[PDB]
Structure 1
Amino acid sequence: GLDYSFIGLSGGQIFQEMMLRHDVKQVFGYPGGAILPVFDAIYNSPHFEFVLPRHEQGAGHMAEGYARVSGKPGVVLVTSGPGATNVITPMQDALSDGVPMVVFCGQVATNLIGSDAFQEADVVGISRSCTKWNVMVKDIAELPRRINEAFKIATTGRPGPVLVDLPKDVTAAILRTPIPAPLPGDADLITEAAQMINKAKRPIIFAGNGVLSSPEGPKLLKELSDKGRIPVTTTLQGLGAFDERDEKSLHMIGMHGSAYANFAMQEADVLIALGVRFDDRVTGKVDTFAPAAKAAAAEGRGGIIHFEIQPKNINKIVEGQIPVLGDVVASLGELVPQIEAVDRSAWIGRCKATKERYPFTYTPSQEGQKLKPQEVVQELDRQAEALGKEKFVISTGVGQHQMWACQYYRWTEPRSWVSSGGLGTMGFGLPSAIGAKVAAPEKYVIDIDGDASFSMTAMELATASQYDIGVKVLLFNNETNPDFVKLSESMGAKGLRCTKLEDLPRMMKEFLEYDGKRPIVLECLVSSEHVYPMIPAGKALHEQLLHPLLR
């Protein structure tokens, strides 16, 4: 009844075996005296590629982007004290956006814990609030089970970050003794939802990050939309779950979503919410959100159908008339076989009409002045669509550029969208891109960052050049700011600068054509504008604020 797999192994040897048991091939971290027994056991092991960023915050964001592309937990390995506390921001971000992440951090020897020794911090207590679950391995015999629980927790339910505090004397010890050794929702409720969907006069699908959990999600979302002739809209984190070049596809919905998705969501009598928490930046004003769904529910002819795996997110912001607790990709599996195709020409026509009457628009740079920001994204969308949209992964910082990427770049590929939407951490774009390019080295990994966001993590370009990680940085600048060209080429990023629409296609092509194993920055002198459409404070979604030439 005893397990001998780990007898005679040190803490780091137990560790690398536990990493292999979880198909962990890529780790991110930073060394330190409190985690050296574990650091030297992984760096020098050839099973794991190790990436040493310039900041432990980068490691966490690099693990986030790595986890978004490769739907598997990003492993982080930082030292105690300052090292671990630097990962607090990336850790809360993973928890806010549901990113699988496992943080192993060092700690002083167990006899020094609590003595406020050198580099001792209550890491288990600091991470406690911002992590899904944490633990401090108090004896080496606990190490294999605590790691199993760490990965299990980080990857089940709504994915999230976990932190495992590793004392120096525990991981430097030797274990001289053995140790003891996708489900859908309720069938009748799924059936109830399908029958409500089939009888719906004008339904809408609302896709979130939960659809991207399994590669079968978007395949079944396409099936639900085709077999039901139902339009689809997505959260900012649902980008890629549905092919936006589909005519059925409304685009992103929310504060800065598309006017047609904001309009159609308010007219729809049935909501098919698939793995989405109803953020305040999605609903606008909670009581005014989906009034046609609210009224259709009062008469029993429709309402909100909610597929969530976390019970705390059901009926937490919007009363769902048919809650379907469970995995959405598994719930969809029993759903789309019960969807009967019905004529919805009028409904699609209504949406397609508004989709052509209120598109994302903007007055282009009339003269030869600085670029309008939408022009830089539109040229990227055109050239990426020609090069092959499936070959692209795109990350962003947090700012105006983040919304431009959601508005003027068309999203087609599942798990090709790496942005901070829950916490909104600026500087996320560059390390997450470095983590994305690591999970998919063969793909065009583009980072759409702004001058302020890029400035919070720009030193990680040195990490991209050191490891031949060819991230292609699309930098939006407006002006107090440095010379980002000389800045980038300081650390090996052979960047260049563009400044005119007539100049834009050549610079965009040369920037995409650059060596995929060599980082490059395309700085764009951009005239920052406002973001339209927008939802004012305390206004409904259909009280949207399109303005340029649509008032």
Structure 2
Amino acid sequence: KKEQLMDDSFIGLTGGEIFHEMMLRHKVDTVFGYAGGAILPVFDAIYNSDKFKFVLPRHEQGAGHMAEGYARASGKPGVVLVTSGPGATNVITPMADALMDGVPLVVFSGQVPTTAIQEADIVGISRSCTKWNVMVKNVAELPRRINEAFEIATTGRPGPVLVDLPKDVTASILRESIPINTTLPSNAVSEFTSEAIKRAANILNKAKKPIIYAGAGILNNEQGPKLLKELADKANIPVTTTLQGLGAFDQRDPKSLDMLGMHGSAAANTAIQNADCIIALGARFDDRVTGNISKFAPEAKLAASEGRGGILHFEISPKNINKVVEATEAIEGDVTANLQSFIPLVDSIENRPEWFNKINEWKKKYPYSYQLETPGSLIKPQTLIKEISDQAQTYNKEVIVTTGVGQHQMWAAQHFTWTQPRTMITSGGLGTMGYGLPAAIGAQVAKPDAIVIDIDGDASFNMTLTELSSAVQAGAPIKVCVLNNEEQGMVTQWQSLFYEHRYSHTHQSNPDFMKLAESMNVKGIRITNQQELKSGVKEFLDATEPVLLEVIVEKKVPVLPMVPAGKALDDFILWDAEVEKQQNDLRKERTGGKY
């Protein structure tokens, strides 16, 4: 019987051949990587493999971000395959990115032989960037480490893992017989949680001003958005989402409060500050969401002390519970599965007249107002976003949006109308510039029949623009739109606000994006005035090839609403036409009329 527990079907294969086989057993159809010395045995095994698609970037950071985009768009883990030394260190930022945003990234880096330990302590470096890392020391434990890597990466709160593959290990041939449970990937509710759910249902049934605060967690299950709506409809609760949760709830729905937070809807911020019961569904209360944490959720905290409300937190990661604010009730585990047990204990309520009246008043009082175009003025960036949003919806394909980091990121978050889950792929936790373009490529590979749009800033785009050639070589018809304000808008907004318009080294020079696109063998479109906006965007979206659209937008335009650091979530700056006018004069006189 001790022969039925051990498998011998891998005897004779090399490390790389076993790697290839384990990828197949984990249903891996895509690999993003860059060749090198230490990782050659693994590359020589995936050589002309018809079993999965390989995507070659120009830079390993590109590979990492592509795999992130793939992972967020498909729900599968994104596999990266880099070499030793610089190949491995170039994936640190994508790994740190994946960690902050809960992205299932599995990174295999080549390594110098075990007899030598382009050398770097990649395990030591990436320890603060990964859920878990390891070095495979011999070929026999390779399938075991691969299995562990994928599972750790995809369970609990998803995140990056690094598996170090020494050249001699992947080059060696397996001769032993390995345990059969290591050749195969895998493959109840505690009474503490079950009673916590019902105790939480009782608190919701007492609430007269409830609100749902939903995030990325509800997207890690395909039934998530379905049950989120079912709960919102049964108990009649308004729904707000984080930046990472955009698309979890149909924003066209009347109960939608849009995005909350630092640059979220002022109606959403006001609602959560006055709510007596907050239902957190897969969100970790980031400081860019809560604002001043002490002053956050006053009515919810007050209701908790009086046993008539509080904060109901549905988390899968214990480290995220009671970290920022005290959870009145903490329902641990997958939010979607727990919602199946939570909803049927919730009282079906039909009308909340007084509460929804305050909300609709707030929604009317707090739109995403901004200064509209004037005759002869540049295209306002907010208008560009709305234009792209409205035209993209009129296609019978699903639309996936990736962004860079800066003002364009927030405007995209604000003025797009989000309706489908996993359609907002953006670097929110770490906030990595140059994320947009490669993330779009990876998304396009995951979803070939989708329209993938990269709403990017010029500065962000300049960081990784070399990956345009990667998009062509991969056959990914991504649609890149660069909001060219010829500035690092986000930083200059801070300098215009807290540093008396002293723009210190925040204006990089941009290349000719049209000649750049031409050199990358990519379609180029440049919109310069208002009259070309509509016809320009249409040509942009109608393209069947990769296309780079450059739009000249207004400079020195603040993103509003804005909750300043230290201020309460409902203590926000609103857009005012007179104020913006006055800021434009103050900027002109201080800078000498140069900005």
Asked if TM exceeds 0.5, the reply is yes
Q: Aligned match of 2:447 in 424, 440, 444?
A: 440
Structure 1 runs of 4+ aligned residues shifted over 3 Å read 181-185
Q: 1:295 to 1:550 in 2, by over 3 A?
A: farther
- Alpha-carbon distance, 1:549 to partner: 4.7
Q: Aligned match of 2:307 in 300, 320, 323?
A: 300
Q: Are 2:268 and 1:241 aligned?
A: no
Identity percentage of aligned residues: 64
Q: Are 2:12 and 1:4 aligned?
A: no
Match of 1:213 in 2: 220
Q: Are 2:25 and 1:15 aligned?
A: no
Aligned residues of 2:370 and 2:575 also touching (Cα < 8 A)? no
- Alpha-carbon distance, 1:446 to partner: 0.2
Q: Secondary structure at the match of 1:244?
A: coil
Aligned residues of 2:260 and 2:269 also touching (Cα < 8 A)? yes
- Alpha-carbon distance, 1:547 to partner: 2.4
Q: Are 2:489 and 1:485 aligned?
A: no
Cα displacement string for residues 72-104 of structure 1 (whole angstroms, at most 9, x for unaligned residues): 100000000010100000000000110000000
- Alpha-carbon distance, 1:167 to partner: 0.3
Match of 1:451 in 2: 458
Q: Aligned match of 2:553 in 520, 523, 526?
A: 526
The residue type equivalent to 1:337 in the other structure is P
Deviates more, 1:477-486 or 1:91-100: 477-486
Match of 1:503 in 2: 532
Q: Aligned match of 1:378 in 386, 390, 396?
A: 386
Q: Are 2:357 and 1:357 aligned?
A: no
Match of 2:478 in 1: 471
Match of 2:183 in 1: none
Q: Secondary structure at the match of 1:150?
A: helix
Q: 1:270 to 1:10 in 2, by over 3 A?
A: same
Cα displacement string for residues 320-348 of structure 1 (whole angstroms, at most 9, x for unaligned residues): 10011111011111112222222213322
CA distance in 2, matches of 1:508, 1:56: 32
Q: How many residues align?
A: 543
CA distance in 2, matches of 1:42, 1:247: 51
The residue type equivalent to 2:356 in the other structure is I
Aligned residues of 1:58 and 1:431 also touching (Cα < 8 A)? yes
Alpha-carbon RMSD across the aligned residues, in angstroms, is: 1.4
Which aligned pairs between 1:281-430 and structure 2 lie closer than 5 A?
281-342=288-349, 343-388=351-396, 391-430=398-437
Q: Secondary structure at the match of 1:542?
A: coil
Aligned residues of 1:184 and 1:330 also touching (Cα < 8 A)? no
Aligned residues of 1:43 and 1:50 also touching (Cα < 8 A)? no
Aligned residues of 2:369 and 2:575 also touching (Cα < 8 A)? no
Cα displacement string for residues 454-482 of structure 1 (whole angstroms, at most 9, x for unaligned residues): 01111111011112110000110013211
- Alpha-carbon distance, 1:180 to partner: 2.2
Cα displacement string for residues 176-203 of structure 1 (whole angstroms, at most 9, x for unaligned residues): 1211249667111111222211221110
Q: Aligned match of 1:546 in 574, 588, 593?
A: 574
The residue type equivalent to 1:523 in the other structure is E
CA distance in 1, matches of 2:345, 2:388: 40
Q: Secondary structure at the match of 2:272?
A: helix
CA distance in 2, matches of 1:380, 1:43: 41
Aligned residues of 1:184 and 1:327 also touching (Cα < 8 A)? no
Normalised TM-score (structure 2):
0.90
The residue type equivalent to 1:530 in the other structure is P
Aligned residues of 1:80 and 1:108 also touching (Cα < 8 A)? yes
Cα displacement string for residues 102-135 of structure 1 (whole angstroms, at most 9, x for unaligned residues): 000100111112xxxxx11111111111111000
Q: 1:43 to 1:329 in 2, by over 3 A?
A: farther
The residue type equivalent to 2:160 in the other structure is P
CA distance in 1, matches of 2:442, 2:177: 37
Match of 2:590 in 1: none
Q: Are 2:29 and 1:25 aligned?
A: yes
The residue type equivalent to 2:475 in the other structure is D
CA distance in 1, matches of 2:189, 2:462: 44
CA distance in 1, matches of 2:170, 2:402: 36
The residue type equivalent to 2:45 in the other structure is A
Q: Which runs of 5+ in 1 are unaligned?
A: 114-118
Aligned residues of 1:358 and 1:550 also touching (Cα < 8 A)? no
Q: Secondary structure at the match of 2:419?
A: coil
- Alpha-carbon distance, 1:537 to partner: 1.9
Q: Are 2:564 and 1:536 aligned?
A: yes
CA distance in 1, matches of 2:450, 2:357: 36
CA distance in 2, matches of 1:368, 1:447: 27
Q: Are 2:73 and 1:69 aligned?
A: yes
Match of 1:514 in 2: 543
CA distance in 1, matches of 2:536, 2:347: 49
CA distance in 2, matches of 1:332, 1:43: 45
Q: Secondary structure at the match of 2:43?
A: helix
CA distance in 1, matches of 2:11, 2:361: 69
Deviates more, 1:53-62 or 1:350-359: 350-359
Which aligned pairs between 1:35-184 and structure 2 lie closer than 5 A?
35-113=39-117, 119-181=118-180
The residue type equivalent to 1:67 in the other structure is A
CA distance in 2, matches of 1:54, 1:277: 34
Deviates more, 1:43-52 or 1:294-303: 43-52
- Alpha-carbon distance, 1:491 to partner: 0.7
- Alpha-carbon distance, 1:544 to partner: 1.1
Match of 1:270 in 2: 277
Cα displacement string for residues 222-265 of structure 1 (whole angstroms, at most 9, x for unaligned residues): 11111111000011101111111111001111100000000000
CA distance in 1, matches of 2:205, 2:546: 50
CA distance in 1, matches of 2:522, 2:307: 59
CA distance in 1, matches of 2:413, 2:147: 37
Q: 1:100 to 1:357 in 2, by over 3 A?
A: same
CA distance in 1, matches of 2:578, 2:262: 17
Deviates more, 1:2-11 or 1:207-216: 2-11
Q: 1:475 to 1:8 in 2, by over 3 A?
A: same
- Alpha-carbon distance, 1:40 to partner: 2.0
Q: Secondary structure at the match of 1:41?
A: coil
The residue type equivalent to 2:528 in the other structure is T
CA distance in 2, matches of 1:151, 1:13: 18
